[PDB]
Paper text:
Cellular entry is achieved by the homotrimeric S mediated virus-receptor engagement through the receptor binding domain (RBD) followed by virus-host membrane fusion. The S1 subunit binds the host cell receptor, while the S2 subunit mediates fusion of the viral membrane with the host cell membrane. Hinge-like movements of the RBD give rise to two distinct conformational states referred to as the “close” and “open”, where close corresponds to the receptor-inaccessible state and open corresponds to the receptor-accessible state, which is supposed to be metastable. We reported a potent therapeutic antibody H014, which can cross-neutralize SARS-CoV-2 and SARS-CoV infections by blocking attachment of the virus to the host cell.
Cryo-EM characterization of the stabilized SARS-CoV-2 S ectodomain in complex with the H014 Fab fragment revealed that the complex adopts three distinct conformational states, corresponding to one RBD open + two RBDs closed (state 1), two RBDs open + one RBD closed (state 2) and all three open RBDs (state 3). Ambiguously, the special conformational transition observed in our complex structures results from the engagement of H014 or a synergistic movement of the SD1 and RBD. Superimposition of the structure of the H014-SARS-CoV-2 trimeric S complex over the ACE2-SARS-CoV-2 RBD complex structure revealed clashes between the ACE2 and H014, arising out of an overlap of the regions belonging to the binding sites located at the apical helix (η4) of the RBD. Thus, the ability of H014 to prevent SARS-CoV-2 from attaching to host cells can be attributed to steric clashes with ACE2.
Author numbering:
A (entry chain D): 2 to 208
B (entry chain E): 2 to 134, 140 to 220
C (entry chain A): 25 to 69, 80 to 172, 186 to 245, 263 to 444, 447 to 620, 641 to 676
D (entry chain B): 533 to 580
The structure:
Amino acid sequence: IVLTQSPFQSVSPKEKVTITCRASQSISSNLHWYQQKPDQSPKLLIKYASQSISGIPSRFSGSGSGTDFTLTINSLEAEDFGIYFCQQTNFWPYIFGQGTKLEILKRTVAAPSVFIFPPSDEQLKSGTASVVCLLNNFYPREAKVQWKVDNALQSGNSESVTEQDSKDSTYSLSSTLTLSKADYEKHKVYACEVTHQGLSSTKSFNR
Amino acid sequence: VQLVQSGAEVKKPGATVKISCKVSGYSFSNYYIHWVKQAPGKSLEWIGYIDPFNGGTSDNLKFKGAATLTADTSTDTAYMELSSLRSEDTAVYYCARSEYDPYYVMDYWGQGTTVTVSSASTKGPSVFPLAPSGGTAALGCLVKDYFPEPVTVSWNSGALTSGVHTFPAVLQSSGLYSLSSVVTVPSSSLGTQTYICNVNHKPSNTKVDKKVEP
Amino acid sequence: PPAYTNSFTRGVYYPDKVFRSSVLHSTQDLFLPFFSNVTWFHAIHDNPVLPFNDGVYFASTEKSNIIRGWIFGTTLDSKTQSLLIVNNATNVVIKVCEFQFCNDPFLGVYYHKNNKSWMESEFRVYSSANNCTFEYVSFKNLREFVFKNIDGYFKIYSKHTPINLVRDLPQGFSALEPLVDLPIGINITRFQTLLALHAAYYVGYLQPRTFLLKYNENGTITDAVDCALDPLSETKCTLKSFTVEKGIYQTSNFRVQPTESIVRFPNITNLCPFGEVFNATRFASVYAWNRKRISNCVADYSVLYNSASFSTFKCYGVSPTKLNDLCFTNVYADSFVIRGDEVRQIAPGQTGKIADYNYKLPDDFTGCVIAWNSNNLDSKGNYNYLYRLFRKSNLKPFERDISTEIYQAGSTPCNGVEGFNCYFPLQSYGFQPTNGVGYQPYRVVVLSFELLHAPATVCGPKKSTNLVKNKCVNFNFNGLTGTGVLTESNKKFLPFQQFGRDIADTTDAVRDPQTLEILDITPCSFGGVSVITPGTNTSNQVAVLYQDVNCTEVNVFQTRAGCLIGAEHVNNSYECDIPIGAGICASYQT
Amino acid sequence: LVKNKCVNFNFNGLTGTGVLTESNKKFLPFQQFGRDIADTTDAVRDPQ
Ligand SMILES: *[C@@H]1O[C@H](CO)[C@@H](O[C@@H]2O[C@H](CO)[C@@H](O)[C@H](O)[C@H]2NC(C)=O)[C@H](O)[C@H]1NC(C)=O
Ligand SMILES: *[C@@H]1O[C@H](CO)[C@@H](O)[C@H](O)[C@H]1NC(C)=O
Ligand SMILES: *[C@@H]1O[C@H](CO)[C@@H](O)[C@H](O)[C@H]1NC(C)=O
Ligand SMILES: *[C@@H]1O[C@H](CO)[C@@H](O)[C@H](O)[C@H]1NC(C)=O
Ligand SMILES: *[C@@H]1O[C@H](CO)[C@@H](O)[C@H](O)[C@H]1NC(C)=O
Ligand SMILES: *[C@@H]1O[C@H](CO)[C@@H](O)[C@H](O)[C@H]1NC(C)=O
Ligand SMILES: *[C@@H]1O[C@H](CO)[C@@H](O)[C@H](O)[C@H]1NC(C)=O
Ligand SMILES: *[C@@H]1O[C@H](CO)[C@@H](O)[C@H](O)[C@H]1NC(C)=O
Ligand SMILES: *[C@@H]1O[C@H](CO)[C@@H](O)[C@H](O)[C@H]1NC(C)=O
Ligand SMILES: *[C@@H]1O[C@H](CO)[C@@H](O)[C@H](O)[C@H]1NC(C)=O
């Protein structure tokens, strides 16, 4: 019992996406499907590969032929995005499909909103100095976060999150510049310069 | 239909995380409860389905934690107690209700059980304010140095709600987690209003409450 | 954080109330072993929960008598009995009185007033106590206590004793007599002390060491020797002496210990023919199935992985994860073909069409139900397969009913022929490629086995591991059980043979059924330990002789007598002094 | 308590048979018995 799915398929709104579960060696008619929004209980889209279980929208559909097992999804909506899993049935225990991360184009690109913060008085006092930049409501989830200690490059101790899915179907990103209190005080401007589709931003707290 | 599970854990390699999955909203006895391993940064991987009337369970070879799915008919709880623990046994384990035939149909699994399995200790945050810069100042809290995930950062113990946009944690230079919760606050509200992030970390029994000040 | 230090000889106490005089007495009792780690602490400018373990130790250096309190138990919510002890203005004040607790239980102290330190009621250590199963009332210095729960008796011991040392436990020896016994009955798993908030204190953990004790004339323990401390101190526990005079003694026996284990079952050769069951092209029908007994074979459950495999592998008797080493006795694979939805009708606590009439397995049944789709193969359709549609009642466990008699629906006799109210019990399934998956015949097997309680014939499939050589291991070869050191050998074993043996009948060799080769065996090591000492009148330096071994398993030398540690070889030769063996005589000189 | 005379006894739960005498052996405040090399109960102390 071996199958595999495409790692992801990034498709566009109103386009149809048929997600591939392609099983190795033996196959049975029964197969199942999923969407999982990150960090959530996987929800079954399809049943016996021939049946969308009740409660699953009409755009989610399923089929299969031989080794091929398909989740046919239609007319993407910007909120729909998730990770799409399949299930081999019988023929000895199963490999769940590795998932399809849905990256939908045509979502709205925006300049990331910078909330940039110095270390708190108790962060400086304790000696752990975190200059905290934040990045909000930017599509797609992308940055290169370049911390500027004064105007110089910071090659180490600057923290970078991998951009994540937010409540708005937007993408939020955190970055902290971690220093000693000494490294914090002696450089005036810690500049958050976030390269987004090739476009950096500027917001800073003067130290 | 509904499954309530065990709490969050940090588990020693070789120890046993016992994940209860308790049946609500349906009948324990009519359904195989499948179990699936979602680790952080991974996909679903089969471990085993339980039978509710039948203690004998197919377990995955693959990763083998000597997983024994014990079907508790008194409390309607399918247990997965995963031994042979490992940093890859850090995972969100979904117990999945499904038919008792070679019909395996599983829709609403457990809510997920976020169980770290690691040598590290359970550690909560060290709370800190964020210092601010028409009339809206940017302040908040950077959560610090905690383990494991997850963490829910509230504000003012329920006295502060709106304006919050919470940014889940950085995987940091220590392999730990610093998240920045930020409420957008007015400048006229500064000095007449208290801003306190209440950052709860359950596995470590840590509550620290602290004021955010300009 | 803990800042450790070295226990020295502290924590020796009278193990009972007996008296003796001038008599070395070896007692085996939980003590604080000599020279160990002691988790240390402070009171500065700090009293966390610790483990209670089997017992504890304690101390403190008080000019000011600031460490006054103790709180033990399981929980510290009061859901246990919550022990307590308090010491007020030299007045001993005890309780078990049980209360709701707090985060920073403490004692208050004030600076230079008429009443010294005040806060003598400070005592927000908890809320309020309720049900009391006992009650009582009453650097320059050193305190020492011992707290151990045994037989519902939480003991105490003590010495309130003067010192001059600031930094650590002084070096010296003073016994600890008991003060109290409380029949409290708790099980303490932890505890916490209670400071006096504006004073070092220690902790050990009692271990089941064996001390040699020396009582004196008056019966006050003057001295002790741990047995297990080190090579010499086992020679004092053997002799019951504090003076160990010159010459070689003998104390212990060291035994090398197994590395992991070795299972061996023959690979390949022949096995339990699960394939001669499962891949049989046509199984028997459901009304009449195939019972094929499986006996005296290494099980084949390995190969069941790579194949079409099953529609489901489902074990109603025991976990398949058990089956691998689980030893069956009477093995029965139940080999038959049924329609699809009827795999739901083969199981315990199940009713339906099949389980009632043409095939039956118990609801306490022990086995594993196996099926997989024959849609690909059996159909052409396939009318070789059939079920019994009607019978007059419900079946018994393991009754194959092949009787073709016509089911009589009505009162009129059928006279062996069909007619009005006469039903042919046996209805075939046409399996046509145009009918769906639920109609598919699934190719069904059920393990039917007894688990234990019959003599050994079939085991689970091979758990036989890989094989390790020249290294002390534990092993089992095909029912041969033993512990030894496996090597390669040259003894040509007989092809039809299995064991080698030896003149005392003890197993001296084997054959590896997976690859036939001749392994010797050999005991672990043995040897005795012989401490070779000049008289303790001279030096506490000892040189151990591990006898009769080769030096690995341990400044090392090697003798004809054995593995000698702690005596430098010397190319001279002198008259014998302490004879060791094979003409090697130690001595103490430079 | 009678001395220099072969008697039987129970002391505080200790029992045995022997000839009690006046002994100079100094016992310990918390120590109940005495003993001797063989574990044979030897010295005791009148509780009352
Ligand atoms: C000592 O108290 C503890 C807790 O009150 C008991 O220890 C538990 O024992 C059970 C088995 O009997 C274990 O499953 C638990 O893990 C133990 N808990 C801990 C914290 O060790 C113990 O029963 C008590 N001692 C005795 C002799 O009864
Ligand atoms: C005592 O503590 C040390 C740490 O310095 C540790 O290495 C040692 O193992 C401990 N003692 C024993 C007997 O293990
Ligand atoms: C000390 O303990 C005794 C015990 O009952 C108590 O009566 C007394 O009030 C306590 N405090 C002082 C200062 O004696
Ligand atoms: C034994 O008792 C006597 C009492 O006269 C005392 O002087 C002596 O010190 C005791 N022995 C020891 C070793 O302390
Ligand atoms: C059945 O045949 C397949 C070949 O298609 C083989 O891989 C499998 O091991 C066989 N099953 C058994 C139980 O021997
Ligand atoms: C053990 O397995 C190997 C290969 O799998 C085979 O060559 C060897 O003959 C087997 N041993 C026996 C006794 O058949
Ligand atoms: C034993 O020690 C004493 C002094 O403690 C010494 O006089 C004597 O010579 C020693 N014994 C031998 C045999 O040397
Ligand atoms: C001791 O062990 C070595 C292996 O390290 C071996 O070569 C040597 O022959 C052994 N000698 C004896 C006497 O056992
Ligand atoms: C003893 O002498 C021989 C040569 O005579 C030498 O090889 C050996 O190392 C010497 N032993 C020691 C312990 O010095
Ligand atoms: C015990 O009581 C008796 C009288 O009842 C008295 O003569 C004796 O002195 C007492 N001894 C002690 C140790 O209390």
